[PDB]
Coordinates of C-alpha atoms and ligand atoms in Angstrom, one line a residue:
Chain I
X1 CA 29.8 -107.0 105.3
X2 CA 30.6 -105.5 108.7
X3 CA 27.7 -102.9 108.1
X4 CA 25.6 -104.7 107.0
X5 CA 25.1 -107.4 110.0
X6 CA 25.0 -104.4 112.3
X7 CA 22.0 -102.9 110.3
X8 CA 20.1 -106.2 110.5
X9 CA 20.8 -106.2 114.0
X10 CA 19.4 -103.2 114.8
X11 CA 16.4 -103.8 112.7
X12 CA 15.6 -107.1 114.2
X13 CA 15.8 -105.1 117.8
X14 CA 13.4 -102.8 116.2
X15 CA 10.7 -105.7 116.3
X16 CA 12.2 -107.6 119.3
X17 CA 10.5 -104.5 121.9
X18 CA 11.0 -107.8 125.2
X19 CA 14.5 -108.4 124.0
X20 CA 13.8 -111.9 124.3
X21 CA 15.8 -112.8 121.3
X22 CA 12.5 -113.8 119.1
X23 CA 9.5 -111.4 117.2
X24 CA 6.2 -112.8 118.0
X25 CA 3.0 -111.8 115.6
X26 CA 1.8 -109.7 118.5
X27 CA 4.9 -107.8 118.3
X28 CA 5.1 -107.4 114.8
X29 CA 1.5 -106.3 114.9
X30 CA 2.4 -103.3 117.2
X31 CA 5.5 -102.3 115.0
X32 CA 3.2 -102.1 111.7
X33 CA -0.2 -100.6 114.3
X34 CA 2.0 -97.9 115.3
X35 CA 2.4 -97.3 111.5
X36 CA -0.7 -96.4 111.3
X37 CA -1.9 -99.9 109.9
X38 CA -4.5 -102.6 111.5
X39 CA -3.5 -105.4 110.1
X40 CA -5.8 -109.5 110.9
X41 CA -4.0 -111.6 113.0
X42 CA -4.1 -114.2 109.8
X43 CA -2.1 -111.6 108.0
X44 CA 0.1 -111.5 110.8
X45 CA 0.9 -115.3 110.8
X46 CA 1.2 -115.4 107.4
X47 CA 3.9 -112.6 107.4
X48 CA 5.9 -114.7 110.6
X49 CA 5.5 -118.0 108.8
X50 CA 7.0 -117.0 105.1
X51 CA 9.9 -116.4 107.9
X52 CA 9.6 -118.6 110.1
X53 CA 11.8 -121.7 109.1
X54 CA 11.8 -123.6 112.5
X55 CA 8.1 -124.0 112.5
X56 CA 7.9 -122.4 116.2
X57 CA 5.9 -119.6 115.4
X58 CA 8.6 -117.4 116.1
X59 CA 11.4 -115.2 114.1
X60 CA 15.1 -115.4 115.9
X61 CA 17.8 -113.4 114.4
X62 CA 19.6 -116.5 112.0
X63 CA 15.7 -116.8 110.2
X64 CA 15.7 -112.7 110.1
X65 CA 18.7 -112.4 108.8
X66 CA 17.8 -115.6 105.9
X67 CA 14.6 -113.6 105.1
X68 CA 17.0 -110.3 104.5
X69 CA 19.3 -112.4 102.5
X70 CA 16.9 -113.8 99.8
X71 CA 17.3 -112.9 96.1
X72 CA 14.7 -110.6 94.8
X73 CA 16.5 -110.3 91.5
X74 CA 18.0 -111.8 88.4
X75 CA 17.0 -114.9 87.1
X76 CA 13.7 -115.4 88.2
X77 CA 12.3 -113.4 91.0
X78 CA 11.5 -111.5 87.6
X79 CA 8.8 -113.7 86.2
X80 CA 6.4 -113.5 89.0
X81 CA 6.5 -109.2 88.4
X82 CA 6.7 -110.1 84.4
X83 CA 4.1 -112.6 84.4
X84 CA 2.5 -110.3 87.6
X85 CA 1.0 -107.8 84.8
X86 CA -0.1 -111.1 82.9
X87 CA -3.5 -111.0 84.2
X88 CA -4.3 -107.3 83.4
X89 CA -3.4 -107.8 79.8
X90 CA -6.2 -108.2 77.6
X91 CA -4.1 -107.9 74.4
X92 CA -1.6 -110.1 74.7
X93 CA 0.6 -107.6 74.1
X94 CA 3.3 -106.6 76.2
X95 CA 1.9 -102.6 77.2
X96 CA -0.7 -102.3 79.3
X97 CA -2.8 -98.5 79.6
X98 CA -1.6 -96.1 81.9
X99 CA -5.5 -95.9 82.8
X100 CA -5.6 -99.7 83.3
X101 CA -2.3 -99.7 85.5
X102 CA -3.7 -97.1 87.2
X103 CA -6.7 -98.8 88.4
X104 CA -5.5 -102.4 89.0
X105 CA -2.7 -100.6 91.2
X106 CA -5.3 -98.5 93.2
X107 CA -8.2 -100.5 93.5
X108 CA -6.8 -103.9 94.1
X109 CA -5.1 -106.1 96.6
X110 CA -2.9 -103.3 98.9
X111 CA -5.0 -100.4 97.3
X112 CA -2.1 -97.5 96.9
X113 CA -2.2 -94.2 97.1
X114 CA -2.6 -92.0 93.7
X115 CA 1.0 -90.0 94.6
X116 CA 2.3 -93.6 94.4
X117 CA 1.0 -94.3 91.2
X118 CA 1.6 -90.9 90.1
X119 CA 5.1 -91.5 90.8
X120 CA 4.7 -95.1 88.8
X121 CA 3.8 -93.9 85.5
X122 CA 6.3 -91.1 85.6
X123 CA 9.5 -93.0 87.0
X124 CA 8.2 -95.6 83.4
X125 CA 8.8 -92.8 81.2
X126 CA 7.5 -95.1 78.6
X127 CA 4.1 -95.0 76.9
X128 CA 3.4 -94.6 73.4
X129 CA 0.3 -92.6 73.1
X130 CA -1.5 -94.8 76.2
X131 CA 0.5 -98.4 76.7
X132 CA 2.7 -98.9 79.2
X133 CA 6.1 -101.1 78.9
X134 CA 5.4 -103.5 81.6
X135 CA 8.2 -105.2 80.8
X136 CA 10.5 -102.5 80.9
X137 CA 8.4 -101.5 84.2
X138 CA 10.3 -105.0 85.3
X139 CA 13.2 -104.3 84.5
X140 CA 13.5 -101.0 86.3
X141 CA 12.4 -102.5 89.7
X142 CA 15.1 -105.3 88.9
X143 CA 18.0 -103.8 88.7
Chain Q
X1 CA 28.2 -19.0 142.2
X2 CA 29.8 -15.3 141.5
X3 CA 30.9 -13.8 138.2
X4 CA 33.8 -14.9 135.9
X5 CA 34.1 -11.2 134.7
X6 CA 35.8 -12.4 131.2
X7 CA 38.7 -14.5 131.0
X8 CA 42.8 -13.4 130.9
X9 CA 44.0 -14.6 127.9
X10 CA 47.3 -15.5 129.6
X11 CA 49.2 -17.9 128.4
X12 CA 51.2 -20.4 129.8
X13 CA 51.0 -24.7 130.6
X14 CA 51.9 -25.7 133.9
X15 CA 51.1 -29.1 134.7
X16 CA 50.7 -32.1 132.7
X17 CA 49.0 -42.1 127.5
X18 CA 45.6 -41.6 126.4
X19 CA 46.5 -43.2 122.5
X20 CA 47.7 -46.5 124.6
X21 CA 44.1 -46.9 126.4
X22 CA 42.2 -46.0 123.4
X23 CA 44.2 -47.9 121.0
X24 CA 43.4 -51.5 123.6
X25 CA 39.6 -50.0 123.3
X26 CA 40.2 -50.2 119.5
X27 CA 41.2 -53.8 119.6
X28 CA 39.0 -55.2 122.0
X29 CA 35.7 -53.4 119.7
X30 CA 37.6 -55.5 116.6
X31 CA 37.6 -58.5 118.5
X32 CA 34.0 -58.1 119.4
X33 CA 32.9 -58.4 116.0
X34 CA 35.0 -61.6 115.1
X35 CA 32.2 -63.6 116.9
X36 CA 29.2 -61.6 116.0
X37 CA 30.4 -61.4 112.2
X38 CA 30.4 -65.2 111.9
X39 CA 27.3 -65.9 113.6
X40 CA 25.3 -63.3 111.2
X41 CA 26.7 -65.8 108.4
X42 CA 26.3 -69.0 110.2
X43 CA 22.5 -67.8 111.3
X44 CA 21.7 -66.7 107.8
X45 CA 22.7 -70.0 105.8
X46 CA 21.0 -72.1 108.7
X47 CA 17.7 -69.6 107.5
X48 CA 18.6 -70.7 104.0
X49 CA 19.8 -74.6 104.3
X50 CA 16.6 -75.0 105.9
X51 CA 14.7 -74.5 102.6
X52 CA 15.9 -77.4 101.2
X53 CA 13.9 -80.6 102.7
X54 CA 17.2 -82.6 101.7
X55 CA 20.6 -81.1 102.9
X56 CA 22.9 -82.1 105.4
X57 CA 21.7 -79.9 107.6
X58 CA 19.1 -81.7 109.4
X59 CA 21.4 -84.4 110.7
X60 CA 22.6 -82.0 113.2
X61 CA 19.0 -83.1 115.2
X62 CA 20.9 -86.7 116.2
X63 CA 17.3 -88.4 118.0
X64 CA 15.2 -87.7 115.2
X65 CA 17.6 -88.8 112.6
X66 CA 18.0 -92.1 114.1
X67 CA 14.3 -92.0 114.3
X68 CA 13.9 -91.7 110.6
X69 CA 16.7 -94.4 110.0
X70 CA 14.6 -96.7 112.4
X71 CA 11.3 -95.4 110.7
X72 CA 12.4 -96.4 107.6
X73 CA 14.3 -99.7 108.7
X74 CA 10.9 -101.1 109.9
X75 CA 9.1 -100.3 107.3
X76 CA 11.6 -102.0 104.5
X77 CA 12.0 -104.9 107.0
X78 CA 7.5 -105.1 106.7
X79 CA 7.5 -104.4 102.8
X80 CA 10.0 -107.7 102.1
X81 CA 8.0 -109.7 104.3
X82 CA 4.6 -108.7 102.7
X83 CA 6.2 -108.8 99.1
X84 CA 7.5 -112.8 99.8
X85 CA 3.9 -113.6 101.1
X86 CA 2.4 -111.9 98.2
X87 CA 5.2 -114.1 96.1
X88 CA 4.0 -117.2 97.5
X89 CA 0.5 -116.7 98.3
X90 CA 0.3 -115.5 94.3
X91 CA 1.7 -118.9 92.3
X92 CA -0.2 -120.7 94.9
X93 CA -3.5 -119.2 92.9
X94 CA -1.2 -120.1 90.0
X95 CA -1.1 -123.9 90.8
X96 CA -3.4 -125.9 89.2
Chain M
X1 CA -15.7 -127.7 85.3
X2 CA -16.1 -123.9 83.5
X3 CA -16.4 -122.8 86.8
X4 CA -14.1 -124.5 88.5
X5 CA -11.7 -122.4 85.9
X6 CA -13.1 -119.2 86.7
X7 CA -13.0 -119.3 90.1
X8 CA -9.4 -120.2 90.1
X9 CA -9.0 -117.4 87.2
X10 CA -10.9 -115.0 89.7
X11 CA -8.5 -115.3 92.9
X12 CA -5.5 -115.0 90.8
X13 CA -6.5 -111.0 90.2
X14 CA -5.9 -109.9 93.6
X15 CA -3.1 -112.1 94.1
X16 CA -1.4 -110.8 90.7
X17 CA -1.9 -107.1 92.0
X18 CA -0.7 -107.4 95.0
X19 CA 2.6 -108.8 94.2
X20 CA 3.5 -105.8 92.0
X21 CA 2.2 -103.5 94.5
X22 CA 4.6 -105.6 96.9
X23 CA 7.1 -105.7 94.7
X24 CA 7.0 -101.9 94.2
X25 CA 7.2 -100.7 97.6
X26 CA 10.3 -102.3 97.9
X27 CA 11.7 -100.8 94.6
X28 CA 10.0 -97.3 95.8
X29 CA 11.6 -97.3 99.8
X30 CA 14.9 -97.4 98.2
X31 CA 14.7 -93.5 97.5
X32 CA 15.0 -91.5 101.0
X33 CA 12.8 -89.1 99.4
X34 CA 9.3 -90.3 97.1
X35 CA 5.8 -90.2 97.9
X36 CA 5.9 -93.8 99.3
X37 CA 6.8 -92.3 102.6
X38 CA 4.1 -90.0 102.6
X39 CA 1.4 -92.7 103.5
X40 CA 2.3 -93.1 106.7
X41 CA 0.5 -89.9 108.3
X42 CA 2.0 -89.5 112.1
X43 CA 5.3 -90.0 110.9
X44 CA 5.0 -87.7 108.0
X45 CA 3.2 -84.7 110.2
X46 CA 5.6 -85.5 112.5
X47 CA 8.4 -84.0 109.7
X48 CA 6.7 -81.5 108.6
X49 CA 6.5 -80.3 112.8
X50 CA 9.8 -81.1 113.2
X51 CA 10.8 -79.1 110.2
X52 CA 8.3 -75.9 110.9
X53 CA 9.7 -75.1 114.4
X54 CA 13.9 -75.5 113.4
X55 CA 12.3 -73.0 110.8
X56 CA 11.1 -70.7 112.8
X57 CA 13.9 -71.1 115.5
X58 CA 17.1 -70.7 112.8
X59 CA 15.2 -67.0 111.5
X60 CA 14.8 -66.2 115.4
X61 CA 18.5 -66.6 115.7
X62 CA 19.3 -64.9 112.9
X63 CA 17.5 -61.4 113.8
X64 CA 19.7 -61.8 117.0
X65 CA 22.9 -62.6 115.3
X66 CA 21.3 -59.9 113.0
X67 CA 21.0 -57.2 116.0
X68 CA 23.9 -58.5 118.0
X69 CA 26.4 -57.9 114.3
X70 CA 25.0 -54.3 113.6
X71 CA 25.7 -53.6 117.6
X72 CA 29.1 -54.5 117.4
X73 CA 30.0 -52.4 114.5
X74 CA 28.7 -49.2 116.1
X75 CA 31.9 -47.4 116.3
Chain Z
X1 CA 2.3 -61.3 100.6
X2 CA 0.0 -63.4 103.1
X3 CA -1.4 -66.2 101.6
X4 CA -4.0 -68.7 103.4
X5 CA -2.3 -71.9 103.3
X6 CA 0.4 -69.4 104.6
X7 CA -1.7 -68.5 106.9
X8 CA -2.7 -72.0 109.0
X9 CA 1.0 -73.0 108.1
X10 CA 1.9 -69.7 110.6
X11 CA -0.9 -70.8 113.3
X12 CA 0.2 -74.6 113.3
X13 CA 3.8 -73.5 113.8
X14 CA 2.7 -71.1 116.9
X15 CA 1.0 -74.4 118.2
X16 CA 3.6 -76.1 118.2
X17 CA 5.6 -74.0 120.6
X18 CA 2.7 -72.8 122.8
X19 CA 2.2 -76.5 123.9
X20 CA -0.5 -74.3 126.7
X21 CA -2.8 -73.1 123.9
X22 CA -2.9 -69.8 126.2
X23 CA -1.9 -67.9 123.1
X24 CA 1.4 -66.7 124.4
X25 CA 4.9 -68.0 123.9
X26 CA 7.4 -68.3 127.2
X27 CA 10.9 -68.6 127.6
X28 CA 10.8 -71.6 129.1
X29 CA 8.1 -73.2 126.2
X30 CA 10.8 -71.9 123.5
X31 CA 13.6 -73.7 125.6
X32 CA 11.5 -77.2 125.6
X33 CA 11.3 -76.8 122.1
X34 CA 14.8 -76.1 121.8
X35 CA 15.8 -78.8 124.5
X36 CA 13.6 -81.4 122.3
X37 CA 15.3 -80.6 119.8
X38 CA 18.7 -81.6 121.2
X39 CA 20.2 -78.6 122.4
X40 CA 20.7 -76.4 125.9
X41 CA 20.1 -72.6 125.6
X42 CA 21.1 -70.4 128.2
X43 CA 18.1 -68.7 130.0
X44 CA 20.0 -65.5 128.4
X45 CA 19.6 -67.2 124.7
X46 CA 16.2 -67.7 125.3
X47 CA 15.0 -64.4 126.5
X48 CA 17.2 -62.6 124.2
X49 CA 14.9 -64.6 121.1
X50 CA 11.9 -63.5 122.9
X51 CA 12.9 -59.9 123.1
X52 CA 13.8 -59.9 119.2
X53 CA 10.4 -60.9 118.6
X54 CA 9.0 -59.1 121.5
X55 CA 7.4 -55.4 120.1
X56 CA 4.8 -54.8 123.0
X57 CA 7.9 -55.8 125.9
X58 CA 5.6 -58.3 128.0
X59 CA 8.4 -60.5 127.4
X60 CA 5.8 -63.3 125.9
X61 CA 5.0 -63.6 122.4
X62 CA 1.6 -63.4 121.3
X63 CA 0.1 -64.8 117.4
X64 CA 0.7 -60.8 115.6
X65 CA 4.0 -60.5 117.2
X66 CA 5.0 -63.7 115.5
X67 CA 3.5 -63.0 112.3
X68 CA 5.5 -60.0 112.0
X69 CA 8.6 -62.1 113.1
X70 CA 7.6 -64.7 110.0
X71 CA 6.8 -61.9 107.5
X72 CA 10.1 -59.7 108.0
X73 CA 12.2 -59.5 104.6
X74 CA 15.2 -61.8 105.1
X75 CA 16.8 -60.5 101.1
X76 CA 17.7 -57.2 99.7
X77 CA 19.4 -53.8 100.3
X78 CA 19.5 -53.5 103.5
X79 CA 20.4 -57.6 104.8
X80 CA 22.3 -58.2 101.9
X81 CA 25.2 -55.7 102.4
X82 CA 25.5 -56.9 106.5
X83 CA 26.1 -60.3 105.5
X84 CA 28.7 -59.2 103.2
X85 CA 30.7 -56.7 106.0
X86 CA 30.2 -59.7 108.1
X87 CA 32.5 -61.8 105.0
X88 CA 34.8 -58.9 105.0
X89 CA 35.6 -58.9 108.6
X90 CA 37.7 -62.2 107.7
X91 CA 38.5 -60.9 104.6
X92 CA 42.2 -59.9 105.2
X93 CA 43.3 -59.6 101.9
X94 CA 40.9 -56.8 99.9
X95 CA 40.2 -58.9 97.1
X96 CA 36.4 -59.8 98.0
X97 CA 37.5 -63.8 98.0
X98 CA 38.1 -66.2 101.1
X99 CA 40.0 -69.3 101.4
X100 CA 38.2 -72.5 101.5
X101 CA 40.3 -73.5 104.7
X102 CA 40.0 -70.1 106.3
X103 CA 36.0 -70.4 105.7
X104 CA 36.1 -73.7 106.7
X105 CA 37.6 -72.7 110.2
X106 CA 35.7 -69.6 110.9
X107 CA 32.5 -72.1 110.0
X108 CA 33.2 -74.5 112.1
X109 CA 35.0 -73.3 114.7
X110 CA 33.3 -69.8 115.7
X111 CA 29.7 -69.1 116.9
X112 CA 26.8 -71.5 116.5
X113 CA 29.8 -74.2 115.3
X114 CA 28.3 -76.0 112.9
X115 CA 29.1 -79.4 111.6
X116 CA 31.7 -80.4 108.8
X117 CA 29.1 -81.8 106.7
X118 CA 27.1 -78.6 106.7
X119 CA 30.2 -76.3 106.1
X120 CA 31.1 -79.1 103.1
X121 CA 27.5 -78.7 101.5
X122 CA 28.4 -74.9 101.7
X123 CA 31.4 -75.1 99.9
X124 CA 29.9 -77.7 97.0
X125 CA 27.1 -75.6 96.9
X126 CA 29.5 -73.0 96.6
X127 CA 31.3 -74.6 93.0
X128 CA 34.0 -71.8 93.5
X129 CA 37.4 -72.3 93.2
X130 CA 40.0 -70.0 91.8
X131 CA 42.8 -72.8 93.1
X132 CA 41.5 -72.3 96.6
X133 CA 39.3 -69.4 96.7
X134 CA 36.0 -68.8 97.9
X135 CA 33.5 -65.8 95.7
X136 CA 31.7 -64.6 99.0
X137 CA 30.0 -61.8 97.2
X138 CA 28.1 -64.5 95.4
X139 CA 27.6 -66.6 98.3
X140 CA 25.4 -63.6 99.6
X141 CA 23.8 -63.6 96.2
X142 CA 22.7 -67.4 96.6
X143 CA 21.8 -67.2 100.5
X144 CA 19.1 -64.1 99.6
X145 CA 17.4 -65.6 96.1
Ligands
CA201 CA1 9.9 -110.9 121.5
CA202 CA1 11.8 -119.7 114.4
CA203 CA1 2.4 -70.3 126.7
CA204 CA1 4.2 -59.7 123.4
K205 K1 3.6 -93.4 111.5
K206 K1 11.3 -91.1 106.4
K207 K1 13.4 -83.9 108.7
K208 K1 15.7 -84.2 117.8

């Protein structure tokens, strides 16, 4: 839709600071430094090259807008969340503790604050004592 | 300077509106407080609008608005981008 | 060959993690409000300084609109 | 009722318009706020929200002076009544209710303006309506919780 385009365009001019018409890692790197962040120059190149499709280490605005496109529902972006919590439970068992949750989601891979997870186990609404419907946890996000 | 030495008690009116120029100083106070009465009003639910961190109220400030739409554009531009590499970089610990 | 396993078991942890943790903060910047905003310090102070000094300027125009309404009445 | 997370909120917010950090606020330091903020005072604006908050008349205002300012009772009695007579000055009809259009105009129209969307928040926030009346002496009530 009309809106739509004009909101990727603005976002992509967000990155772009040179207006050259491409977002380099260096400039992505001072978008998410003046975030507060300090993110490697590996992560950096990953993050360009999951969007870049060209292969020319750059993003232009047709790749951008592919990237903002993508499916992150339905079907089966929904495993890889489902099947996400498959390594945390021990039980086989589709619950996980809200004790558990709570320290995978803080203490691993991009760490979290506890307001974050505070707000995860209360937007769940589900647990039964102390297990947590991670399934229904998918669901939610899914939607 | 001198004496009066009483008065005379005589009585008589030689000589001689004032309800037209105090009748325009009438309206003109009214229309005085058409402006000031609305303001009070205006003023006070500004003081109390300003309570709530929502409301529309704060989208009156137009550069910092379109500094929070850009803030949060950026950031939900970053998040996608992180969540695909963690997509791919994840089955790719999940391929044998 | 036990370890090969394990090892591949072992970075599939922080990979599994991160993609819900990815896949959250995607689901949480939906909502204008949340605490997912709040990790972003600068931006956040910034808010609260942008918010404390409207504050304090809407009362100080009120107390004149205050004085300015009672002087007009003053018959 | 001074509490101290009150407290350093009240010396933060003093901060923030004495960017000088010589303790005293200035016309001119309120107007850069202001001008930040998107708006143009008139130097008469400006020194007229000094003077409000202005007790000791050095036409600067010092940490107390804005304490006091931040501390005065904004509900009750005696600020509660005003904003009413200020509702009755359009209220041509007796009856303590306004029309939604005639608030709508006198909103938006007279003093400090204000935008459609704030005067529509007033009147949803308002959830009156006798066909197309307005309950002002309940408005007043909300405004001073
Ligand atoms: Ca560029
Ligand atoms: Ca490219
Ligand atoms: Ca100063
Ligand atoms: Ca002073
Ligand atoms: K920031
Ligand atoms: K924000
Ligand atoms: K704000
Ligand atoms: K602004």
């Amino acid at each position: 839709t009309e809106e739509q385009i004009a909101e990727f365009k603005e976002a992509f001019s967000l990155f772009d600071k040179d207006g050259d018409g491409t977002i380099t890692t260096k400039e992505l790197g001072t978008v998410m430094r003046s975030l507060g962040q300090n993110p490697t120059e590996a992560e950096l190149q990953d993050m360009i090259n999951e969007v870049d499709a060209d292969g020319n280490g750059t993003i232009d605005f047709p790749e951008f807008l592919t990237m903002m496109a993508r499916k992150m529902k339905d079907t089966d972006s929904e495993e890889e969340i489902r099947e996400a919590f498959r390594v945390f439970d021990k039980d086989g068992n589709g619950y996980i503790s809200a004790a558990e949750l709570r320290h995978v989601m803080t203490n691993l891979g991009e760490k979290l604050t506890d307001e974050e997870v505070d707000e995860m186990i209360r937007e769940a609404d589900i647990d039964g004592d102390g297990q947590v419907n991670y399934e229904e946890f998918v669901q939610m996000m899914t939607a | 300077h001198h004496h009066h030495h009483h008065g005379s008690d005589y009585d008589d009116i030689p000589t001689t509106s004032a309800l037209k120029v105090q009748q325009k100083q009438r309206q003109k106070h009214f229309n005085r407080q058409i402006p000031a009465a609305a303001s009070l009003i205006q003023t006070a639910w500004r003081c109390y609008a300003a309570e709530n961190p929502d409301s529309s109220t704060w989208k009156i400030y137009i550069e910092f608005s379109q500094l929070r739409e850009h803030h949060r554009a950026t950031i939900k531009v970053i998040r996608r981008m992180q969540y695909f590499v963690a997509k791919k970089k994840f089955q790719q610990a999940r391929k044998p």
